[model samples]
Target chain A: AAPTATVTPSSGLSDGTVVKVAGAGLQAGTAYDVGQCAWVDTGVLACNPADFSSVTADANGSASTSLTVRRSFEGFLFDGTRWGTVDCTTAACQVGLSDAAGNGPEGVAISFN
Target chain B: AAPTATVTPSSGLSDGTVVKVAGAGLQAGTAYDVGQCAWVDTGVLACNPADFSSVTADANGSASTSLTVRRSFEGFLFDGTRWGTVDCTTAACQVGLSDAAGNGPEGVAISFN
Candidate 1:
């Protein structure tokens, strides 16, 4: 089965809200970065690099963590060669999980507040 | 006189455009950080921290430098206590100069392309 994610109180997120996030079917013992991200046509434009949380999958390939969400947040997006700005409010922002290095598969759970 | 800024070929900015920036009437010998920033109602939401340029005013209180502009860029914004994401496309982005510590005056010249 593909990796999956779920968010607690999955809606009505606002600035400074702490939301619980859980992921299943991931690689066991792997670490992941969890945060709000902007999904653009080119893929994941950017993720909250600073105000983000992390989780390490357990032996059952399940992981859980929580993050503070903001209505308007910031992050850097890679444009093939360099990193640039990506705002959550400008695109389809969502709470998701990606590899620790942000180079592996991304598992999105729900929209950001 | 108040400090002023100007951008060379002040229009048609895109990704990877090198823009010439000049400033006058600044503090002599003072160092400043120059880059594309998002100006919001709460003040400067964020600036391109990684892809920014710098210049030190000369004895005449004049300085000149350049920066690479991108249509979509990323940076961290201080939300009073901590840093968050700020995307240029989502805010009023501009080519501006601020104190090296980013806690002083800001001189904005032209809007980002």
Candidate 2:
């Protein structure tokens, strides 16, 4: 419904800058998988090649898919969902995460003007 | 201070979904307002989205508004005065907030569970 969606970056991006493998419903092109300890969907997604990769989704479902972002990526998309900055370097590098097979993850969020 | 907040989706909900905007605080007819955002408040509030939403308090006083959450829209809320929701998306969304003189609109937030 507008549960929420905003990925403002791209076009000389700048805001503390951190991104490794951004995602959103991504499921049209396939190949947006990376891992480390958590985040095949949530454990943590790959911070930067701990071992995991598929990286592919761009037709539009959306996927920033390219990072090594370090030091400037906050935290909380933990169980409820959206958590990126898997890791980064050279201005950004790192991406990691995993947690499939549900039964966990519900917390809902919405902030206002 | 605890830290961390989660938001899955609501009504039997689903998974993480965070939301935070401007420097949220509220009042007036009140709501989690959205510009019109107004889930209207909760005991734990909305869920999902993070990288630390200034955790460090829940009644999370203004050394920094210490804490404020509700994600399903998005990571970290550390230092938080509270970190709850095995998955509690009471999903308020108080809309906008004004705080001091506005008691106003960002439909801010309200929680206590």
Cα RMSDs, all models: 19.7, 18.4
The alpha-carbon lDDT assigned to residue A94 of candidate 2 equals: 25
Per-residue accuracy of model 1 over A67-91 as CA lDDT, tens digit each: 8876665566654332445544455
TM-score of each: 0.43, 0.21
Candidate 2, residues A23-107: lDDT per residue as tens digits?
A: 5433336454443222335344323332344445456534554433223343324254545543322222223322232111111
Off by over 4 Å in 2: A1-33, A38-50, A60-113, B1-34, B39-91, B95-113
* CA lDDT for candidate 1: 0.64
For model 1, the TM-score of its B chain against the native B chain is 0.77
Cα lDDT for residue B57, candidate 1: 81
Candidate 2 chain A: 10-residue stretch with minimal lDDT: A103-112
Per-candidate DockQ vs. reference: 0.01, 0.01
Model 1 chain A worst lDDT window (10 residues): A100-109
Q: What overall lDDT goes with each candidate model?
A: 0.64, 0.30
